[PDB]
Amino acid sequence: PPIGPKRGSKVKILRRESYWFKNVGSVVAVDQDPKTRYPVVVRFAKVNYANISTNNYALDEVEEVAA
Amino acid sequence: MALRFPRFSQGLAQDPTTRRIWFGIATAHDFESHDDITEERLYQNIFASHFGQLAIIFLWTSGNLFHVAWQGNFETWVQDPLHVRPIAHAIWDPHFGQPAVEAFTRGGALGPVNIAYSGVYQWWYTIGLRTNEDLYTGALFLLFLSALSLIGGWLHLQPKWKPRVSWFKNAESRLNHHLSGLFGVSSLAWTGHLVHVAIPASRGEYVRWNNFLNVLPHPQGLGPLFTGQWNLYAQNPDSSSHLFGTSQGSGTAILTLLGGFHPQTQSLWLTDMAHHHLAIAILFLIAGHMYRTNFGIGHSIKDLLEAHIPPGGRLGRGHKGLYDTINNSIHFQLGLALASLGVITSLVAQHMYSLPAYAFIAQDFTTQAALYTHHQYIAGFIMTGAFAHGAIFFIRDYNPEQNEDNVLARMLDHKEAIISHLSWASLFLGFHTLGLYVHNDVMLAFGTPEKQILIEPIFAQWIQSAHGKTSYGFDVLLSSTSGPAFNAGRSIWLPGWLNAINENSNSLFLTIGPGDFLVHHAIALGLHTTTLILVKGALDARGSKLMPDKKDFGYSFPCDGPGRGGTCDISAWDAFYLAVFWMLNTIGWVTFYWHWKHITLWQGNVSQFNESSTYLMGWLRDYLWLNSSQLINGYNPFGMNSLSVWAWMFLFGHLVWATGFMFLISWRGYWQELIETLAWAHERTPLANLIRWKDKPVALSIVQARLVGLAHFSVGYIFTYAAFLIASTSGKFG
Amino acid sequence: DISGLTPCKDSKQFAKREKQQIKKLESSLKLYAPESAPALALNAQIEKTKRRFDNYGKYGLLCGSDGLPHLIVNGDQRHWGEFITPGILFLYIAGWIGWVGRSYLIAISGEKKPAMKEIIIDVPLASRIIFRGFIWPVAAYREFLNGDLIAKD
Amino acid sequence: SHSVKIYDTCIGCTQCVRACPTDVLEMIPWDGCKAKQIASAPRTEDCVGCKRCESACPTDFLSVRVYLWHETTRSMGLAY
Amino acid sequence: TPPQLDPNTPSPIFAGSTGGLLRKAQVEEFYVITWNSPKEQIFEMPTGGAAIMREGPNLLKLARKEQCLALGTRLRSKYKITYQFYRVFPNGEVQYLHPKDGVYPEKANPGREGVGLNMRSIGKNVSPIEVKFTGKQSYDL
Amino acid sequence: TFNNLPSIFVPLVGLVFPAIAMASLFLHIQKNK
Amino acid sequence: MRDLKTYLSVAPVLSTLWFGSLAGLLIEINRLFPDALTFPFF
Amino acid sequence: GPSAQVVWPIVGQEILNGDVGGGFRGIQITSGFFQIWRASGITSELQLYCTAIGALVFAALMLFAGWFHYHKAAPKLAWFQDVESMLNHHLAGLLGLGSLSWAGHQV
Numbered sequence A: 001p002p003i004g005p006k007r008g009s010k011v012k013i014l015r016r017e018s019y020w021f022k023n024v025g026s027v028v029a030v031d032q033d034p035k036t037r038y039p040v041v042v043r044f045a046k047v048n049y050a051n052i053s054t055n056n057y058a059l060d061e062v063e064e065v066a067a
Numbered sequence B: 001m002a003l004r005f006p007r008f009s010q011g012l013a014q015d016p017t018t019r020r021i022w023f024g025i026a027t028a029h030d031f032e033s034h035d036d037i038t039e040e041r042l043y044q045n046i047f048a049s050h051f052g053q054l055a056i057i058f059l060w061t062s063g064n065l066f067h068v069a070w071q072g073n074f075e076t077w078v079q080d081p082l083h084v085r086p087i088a089h090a091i092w093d094p095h096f097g098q099p100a101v102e103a104f105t106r107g108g109a110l111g112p113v114n115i116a117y118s119g120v121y122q123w124w125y126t127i128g129l130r131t132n133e134d135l136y137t138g139a140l141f142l143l144f145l146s147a148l149s150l151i152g153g154w155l156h157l158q159p160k161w162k163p164r165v166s167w168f169k170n171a172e173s174r175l176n177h178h179l180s181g182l183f184g185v186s187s188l189a190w191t192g193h194l195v196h197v198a199i200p201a202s203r204g205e206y207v208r209w210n211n212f213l214n215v216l217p218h219p220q221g222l223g224p225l226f227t228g229q230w231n232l233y234a235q236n237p238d239s240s241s242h243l244f245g246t247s248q249g250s251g252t253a254i255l256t257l258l259g260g261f262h263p264q265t266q267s268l269w270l271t272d273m274a275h276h277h278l279a280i281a282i283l284f285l286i287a288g289h290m291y292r293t294n295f296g297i298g299h300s301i302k303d304l305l306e307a308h309i310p311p312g313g314r315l316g317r318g319h320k321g322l323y324d325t326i327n328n329s330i331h332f333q334l335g336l337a338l339a340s341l342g343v344i345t346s347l348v349a350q351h352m353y354s355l356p357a358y359a360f361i362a363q364d365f366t367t368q369a370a371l372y373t374h375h376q377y378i379a380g381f382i383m384t385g386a387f388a389h390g391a392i393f394f395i396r397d398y399n400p401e402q403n404e405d406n407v408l409a410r411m412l413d414h415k416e417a418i419i420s421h422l423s424w425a426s427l428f429l430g431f432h433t434l435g436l437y438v439h440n441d442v443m444l445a446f447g448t449p450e451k452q453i454l455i456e457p458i459f460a461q462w463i464q465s466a467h468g469k470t471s472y473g474f475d476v477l478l479s480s481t482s483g484p485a486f487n488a489g490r491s492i493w494l495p496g497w498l499n500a501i502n503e504n505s506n507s508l509f510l511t512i513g514p515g516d517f518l519v520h521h522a523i524a525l526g527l528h529t530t531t532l533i534l535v536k537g538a539l540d541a542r543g544s545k546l547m548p549d550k551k552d553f554g555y556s557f558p559c560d561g562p563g564r565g566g567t568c569d570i571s572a573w574d575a576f577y578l579a580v581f582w583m584l585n586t587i588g589w590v591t592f593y594w595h596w597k598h599i600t601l602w603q604g605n606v607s608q609f610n611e612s613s614t615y616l617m618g619w620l621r622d623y624l625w626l627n628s629s630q631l632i633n634g635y636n637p638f639g640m641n642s643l644s645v646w647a648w649m650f651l652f653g654h655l656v657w658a659t660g661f662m663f664l665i666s667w668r669g670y671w672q673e674l675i676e677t678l679a680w681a682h683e684r685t686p687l688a689n690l691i692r693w694k695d696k697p698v699a700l701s702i703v704q705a706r707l708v709g710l711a712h713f714s715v716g717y718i719f720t721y722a723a724f725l726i727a728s729t730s731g732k733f734g
Numbered sequence C: 001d002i003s004g005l006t007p008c009k010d011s012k013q014f015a016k017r018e019k020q021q022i023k024k025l026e027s028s029l030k031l032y033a034p035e036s037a038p039a040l041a042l043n044a045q046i047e048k049t050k051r052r053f054d055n056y057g058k059y060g061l062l063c064g065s066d067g068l069p070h071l072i073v074n075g076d077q078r079h080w081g082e083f084i085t086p087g088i089l090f091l092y093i094a095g096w097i098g099w100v101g102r103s104y105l106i107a108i109s110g111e112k113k114p115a116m117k118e119i120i121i122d123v124p125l126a127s128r129i130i131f132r133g134f135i136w137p138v139a140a141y142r143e144f145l146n147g148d149l150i151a152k153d
Numbered sequence D: 001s002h003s004v005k006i007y008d009t010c011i012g013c014t015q016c017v018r019a020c021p022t023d024v025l026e027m028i029p030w031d032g033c034k035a036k037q038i039a040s041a042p043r044t045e046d047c048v049g050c051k052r053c054e055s056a057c058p059t060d061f062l063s064v065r066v067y068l069w070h071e072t073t074r075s076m077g078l079a080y
Numbered sequence E: 001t002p003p004q005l006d007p008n009t010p011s012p013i014f015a016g017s018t019g020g021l022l023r024k025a026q027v028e029e030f031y032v033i034t035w036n037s038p039k040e041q042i043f044e045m046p047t048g049g050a051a052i053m054r055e056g057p058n059l060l061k062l063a064r065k066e067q068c069l070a071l072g073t074r075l076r077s078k079y080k081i082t083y084q085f086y087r088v089f090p091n092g093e094v095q096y097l098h099p100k101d102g103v104y105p106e107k108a109n110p111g112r113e114g115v116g117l118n119m120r121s122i123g124k125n126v127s128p129i130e131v132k133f134t135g136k137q138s139y140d141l
Numbered sequence F: 001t002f003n004n005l006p007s008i009f010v011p012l013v014g015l016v017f018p019a020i021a022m023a024s025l026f027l028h029i030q031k032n033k
Numbered sequence G: 001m002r003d004l005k006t007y008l009s010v011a012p013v014l015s016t017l018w019f020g021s022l023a024g025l026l027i028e029i030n031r032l033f034p035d036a037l038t039f040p041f042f
Numbered sequence H: 001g002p003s004a005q006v007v008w009p010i011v012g013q014e015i016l017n018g019d020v021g022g023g024f025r026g027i028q029i030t031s032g033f034f035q036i037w038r039a040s041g042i043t044s045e046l047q048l049y050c051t052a053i054g055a056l057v058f059a060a061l062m063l064f065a066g067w068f069h070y071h072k073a074a075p076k077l078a079w080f081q082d083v084e085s086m087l088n089h090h091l092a093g094l095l096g097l098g099s100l101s102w103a104g105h106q107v
């Protein structure tokens, strides 16, 4: 079974140290390897201070938004 | 611990560069960051350092007393005080030219001298201390107290008396003793002085240590106190004709509550201050016996904080767990302490000018200005330090898992709201204060001062009218005779208070106007903006979206690199450092306002301030340009006068205020790449290859250079304004 | 007569300020021919000054010892026209602006790249949104009651 | 001298090492990312502190992380 | 891999500059870079100026590691040659420095170990109160 | 000789004591145990 | 004109047009009602 | 006082029109343009007006020249890189004949 969210599921972030903390994002892809610690690649509408719109997040550092 | 000079830090000792010297100077008193440190040793070093500071305080006061006793005209000043100049100390400068010796000879002195603008003359004369031998005795006693504090600080570093970590954390017994004894018994003892000495000294006779056991401060003597007939201590209030220092018009009362000022000295009554210190002595001795120490009664501050959780959770977990984040954290203790100290220092400044306690201190005008400026700049600095130490607490000492959801973590939960609404209030105040000031600048520019926006401060005039000031016709609680406030106090203190406040010549509740409104809103802008910077650095001390790991970098660190757009001045230290600029600006505003209002009151033309304080070219022309004439003419090509030192200090403060701009504007990288060329030149210059540094000469570090620029900046700010405020107020003296 | 201020139609210092400014203008009016254009501009400024002082007389402005119109912003009805009747007229207009620029930002919030409408303003969309803020106070009121004024994160 | 500690959020892009002007960093094999490599930091004693490694780290905040610490002649960028 | 054993190879043609080894070589470590240039060509050396590196082996002694690695990256990116530099202490003991495995550090060679590596996200570091009155910091657990 | 005491102490604290302190603290700055 | 209305839609061109119109409005109001310090119209 | 700027009487800024002299209320300028115009022998506002129209003509001319020399017919690098001609022309023609024609005006 494919682990994590889907390749178009909307998600929000519970990572304290992220720029998009408590901000929603779009799951690009989830690495199905059970050895990558941060498989959930998320895409965000607004860039961070490094002019980057995406980062890999963990499964527990993420929350499938109900919208 | 280490090898080279920073023995307290083997990271700077193992630094080949000159940064070792600087950082070992700076981080010397940061005991929390030293090597091989324990909470026990930290507390013990703090205790011994407090002893050292008390020793230096008593030594500095002994020096004041000695240099007024030896080189002062204090015996001549107590004869005709309001027409004889104080003398701080003598001067032996071998660079002085003979004109400068002719000029600095003041106060009827054998040589050149310095005028005590500090008020120690007035204060010492008010508390007794008539002859110079009394000041000599005081200096000897304070030398003894300095040696006693040094003895205590050395003794409480030895193992037999090194107090334990759990003894400095006894936060109930310490409050009990300090409220009861340090605050209460000390106020009680000052009442004892004011009653046995200072009141008899004001009323003639000189009650000294040889003859104080056989003179009665009150002719009955402890009958009234023990019998409860305390009104007998308010029988003869030396009403309205008493000459301070002589028995003409004197009285017998020692604790009469009169309110208002002496008629002669325009200071408060020593009976009033005796009764005052007695009353707060009772209140502090009562408030002391509150916290449980050893005896099975009293409160535990824990179960007061733990119990103050509101149902409904509007605060959250309340103060549940806040005893531990203050008792175990010395930076919270220091932040609260400096907060209270800055508040009460500002209070000292704001009350000592309007309710002067010392004899003939309202009559010498430079003294009041120097004192208000001093205590307000001290208060602004102490407030900036309160906040800086709150930031250092949030970084070093704050444990979020110990204080989850309590009243302190809820700060960081919504820190953006606090910071953004402070950023609203300051922005509103600046936009509108500056807009009105610029509107009035342009109206006076276009020759239409009637078009000015002169918003009357109705809400402060209403408070003045709630205190008996019959200058606005509001007819409020104490300006109205038919009121409960003008009935329950009309027999006790409102006579003197009304007759003091209604006098337009004193500083008690000055008649204000629209310039006072505008400058009060400039003051509010300064306070709100300094608060914004400091609170923002304190709450973003642990981290932000730009640097969430800031807590791992400590309080003072330069930056986080050019990445992520750029992280210059991101530390909480940098917030402090920018807030010192905004603080000095704020206190410059409050003290410009004070000094111009008061120099216009003392001159006589209050209309000058009232018509000229509403537009900024009035502050530049009629205050800075006008009052600085006698200052900058302290030394002209054809001679000099006594204000030559203040002109020189004025220009000196300008020079260092400008030199701070070198370190603030010009940053590192240019200087390291300059000193590389200098090092090349020294290593290739003949007859100087012989000489070689032992410390590799690097440029100043970044955060260091922000500090050094801030130090030059503040030194120049302070020296410039001290020179201008003393020279202008001493060139004419009202 | 609040705050110890005489009215400006009765204040002698106000009339003295008027006469001083008028004499200052007339001393500059003597240097020009009475029919010339600088002289006519100075005379127009003189009538402007005179009717300015008359209008500050009739509109209930209070003048202090310095003799300048002070504004009583406390809430006295006699002086609402000094602060509150303009102030509401500010909070309306200001709240027009913010209710427009906010609404616009909500109308271009659901675009693909909504930043290229921040720098390149849709004039049709902005003109449709601008007059929505005419009666903005009821929209802001209802959006506060409906919760649409505050985002829920 | 300095302390260049890295964290497991690294994705193995090899930009922190390609920016490093002092060879502090080097990619090692690892199993925690799609690229199967992570950036170690053996030569921390050669670190000047320029933070080019973390001005090139494309994570949400950072994976490589320079903590400035005891400054030696190698870390003070001194050719003399 | 075994190091490359710095020989007494020749140096570039340079007329001398004020960017050399002042005192960090006399009493402290200085550095030396060796590169095999296929042809003789001009290059901007990091101590200011412009030198002409010879054909075959070249050797340039520099004052710090950043000069060596800056020159090396410019060589590897512009002239595409393979550089390798050392560190020579004033008593000897030439230390092989740059590749340390034969292959450049951007390539994940096996054998090199994980040093300076935390198995946690960056914001799971404990607070300074946890490591207070301890020689450890908040990033070394 | 009490108007001569400033002439004794102002150099002794201002020239001599600064030389003493600067020399001693420069030695303490460069010491190595 | 296509792509001129997009340029005139740009933030500085649009800001200068809006503030020129607005400043002319304020300027002509102050010509009509000069030297105003109260709102007496109620 | 040399004055060549008048303000509009709107918000009391009309007092910036000072008694500079000559039956004129304006801002005393400091560009020394009046001194240039006396050095040129102007002596009439018609001449200043027509050289203003001429300078507007030359502004339109330079704007059209920039449009032409970017968008319609632009030089290539062989035109700029030759500098002997650029110097010869900017010396003999711009600065040489420029000073010659100014000397002709003056004479």
Ligand code: CLA
Residues within 6 Å of the ligand: B046, B047, B050, B051, B054, B167, B168, B170, B171, B173, B174, B177, B178, B180, B181, B182, B183, B186, B344
């Ligand atoms: C009644 C007993 C008693 C008394 C008198 C004191 C007294 C003191 N303790 Mg405490 N202490 C006690 C019991 C007591 N302690 C106990 C039982 C413990 C164990 C729990 C401690 C533990 C303890 C620690 C750990 C420390 C002290 C410290 C101090 C000193 C405070 C510094 C200072 O000068 O503040 C002076 C401040 C005031 C008098 C308050 C004045 C504030 C008012 C509101 C200002 C306005 C009026 C102003 C005075 C007028 C000025 C006019 C003119 C005269 C200039 C002071 C000597 C500190 C210290 O310095 O160590 C040496 C310190 O570090 N104590």
Ligand code: CLA
Residues within 6 Å of the ligand: B422, B423, B424, B426, B427, B428, B429, B430, B431, B434, B525, B529, B532, B533, B578, B579, B581, B582
């Ligand atoms: C005269 C100098 C000056 C001025 C005007 C300000 C102004 C301000 N500072 Mg301070 N600041 C200064 C010097 C100054 N600073 C210095 C020397 C330092 C030390 C580095 C700091 C450090 C500092 C910090 C650390 C912080 C501030 C903050 C602020 C803002 C406070 C809110 C406020 O009053 O806004 C009201 C607005 C003004 C006073 C701006 C004045 C300009 C007018 C009103 C705008 C319109 C002008 C004009 C029409 C534009 C046309 C020109 C052009 C387009 C052609 C504001 C922008 C705080 C902040 O920004 O948070 C809110 C803050 O946190 N400043």
Ligand code: CLA
Residues within 6 Å of the ligand: B090, B091, B092, B093, B094, B095, B100, B114, B644, B645, B648, F010, F013, F014, F015, F017, F018, F021, F022
């Ligand atoms: C060339 C300029 C110059 C110099 C060198 C001096 C020198 C002096 N003047 Mg000044 N003076 C000058 C120009 C100068 N004057 C001019 C132009 C005027 C205007 C007419 C005056 C007006 C003037 C007055 C009015 C007075 C002096 C006084 C003094 C003496 C200070 C006593 C002393 O050394 O205490 C010790 C010095 C200090 C405490 C100040 C130094 C503070 C340091 C920098 C801060 C601390 C740093 C750190 C903790 C310690 C590091 C050093 C360490 C190694 C010891 C001293 C001889 C005073 C005097 O003679 O009274 C005794 C005095 O009252 N002067």
Ligand code: CLA
Residues within 6 Å of the ligand: B431, B432, B434, B435, B436, B438, B439, B442, B451, B452, B453, C092, C093, G026, G029, G030, G034, G035, G036, G037, G038, H010, H011, H012
């Ligand atoms: C923030 C501070 C501040 C404040 C409060 C003021 C306030 C004022 N200034 Mg000052 N001024 C300021 C800053 C400030 N200024 C600054 C910074 C400068 C320098 C740039 C000036 C320079 C200046 C000059 C030189 C002059 C003023 C003048 C004025 C007055 C404006 C009269 C006017 O034309 O408005 C009239 C009202 C408007 C223009 C608003 C009209 C808005 C439109 C038409 C919409 C309203 C209708 C709307 C549809 C709602 C209707 C309700 C319903 C039917 C829908 C007023 C007292 C003038 C004056 O009279 O002096 C006292 C004047 O000559 N000011």
Ligand code: CLA
Residues within 6 Å of the ligand: H004, H005, H016, H027, H028, H029, H030, H031, H032, H033
């Ligand atoms: C808006 C008011 C205004 C205007 C339009 C002018 C215009 C002029 N003045 Mg006058 N002047 C003014 C105000 C003004 N001045 C004031 C307040 C004073 C002080 C009393 C003077 C004093 C004065 C003197 C003494 C002299 C002039 C002269 C001149 C002329 C030459 C200067 C020139 O071309 O500027 C060129 C200036 C620049 C290119 C600098 C940059 C300015 C930029 C373009 C402003 C852009 C503003 C924009 C609308 C808004 C912000 C844009 C955005 C970036 C945010 C010109 C006719 C001279 C002359 O010979 O007159 C015939 C002369 O000698 N003026």
Ligand SMILES: CC1=C(/C=C/C(C)=C/C=C/C(C)=C/C=C/C=C(C)/C=C/C=C(C)/C=C/C2=C(C)CCCC2(C)C)C(C)(C)CCC1
Residues within 6 Å of the ligand: B331, B332, B333, B334, B335, B336, B338, B339, B340, B343, B383, B386, B387, B388, B389, B390, B391, B393, B394, B535, B538
């Ligand atoms: C950062 C931080 C910190 C610091 C902070 C600060 C520094 C603060 C400050 C603060 C302040 C500085 C405050 C103040 C306040 C004040 C108030 C709050 C007031 C009140 C008042 C009242 C209430 C009054 C009343 C009255 C009157 C009106 C008069 C007469 C009498 C009576 C009584 C009636 C800490 C450490 C804490 C912690 C951490 C964080």
Ligand SMILES: CC1=C(/C=C/C(C)=C/C=C/C(C)=C/C=C/C=C(C)/C=C/C=C(C)/C=C/C2=C(C)CCCC2(C)C)C(C)(C)CCC1
Residues within 6 Å of the ligand: H050, H051, H052, H053, H054, H055, H058, H097, H098, H100, H101
């Ligand atoms: C002010 C101005 C203006 C105007 C100006 C002008 C008008 C100018 C002119 C100019 C001119 C009008 C010029 C001319 C020139 C000429 C020349 C430069 C000539 C030369 C000649 C020669 C060189 C010769 C030779 C010869 C001879 C000798 C003889 C015969 C033969 C021959 C021909 C060969 C304008 C509007 C623009 C505007 C701006 C300013």
Ligand code: SF4
Residues within 6 Å of the ligand: D006, D009, D010, D011, D012, D013, D014, D015, D016, D017, D038, D039, D053, D056, D057, D058, D059, D063, D064
């Ligand atoms: S730059 Fe960051 S993500 Fe890329 S290899 Fe280095 S540590 Fe990993």
Ligand code: SF4
Residues within 6 Å of the ligand: D004, D016, D019, D020, D021, D022, D023, D024, D025, D046, D047, D048, D049, D050, D051, D052, D053, D054, D066
């Ligand atoms: S700070 Fe500079 S030298 Fe240190 S690891 Fe990062 S890139 Fe390399």
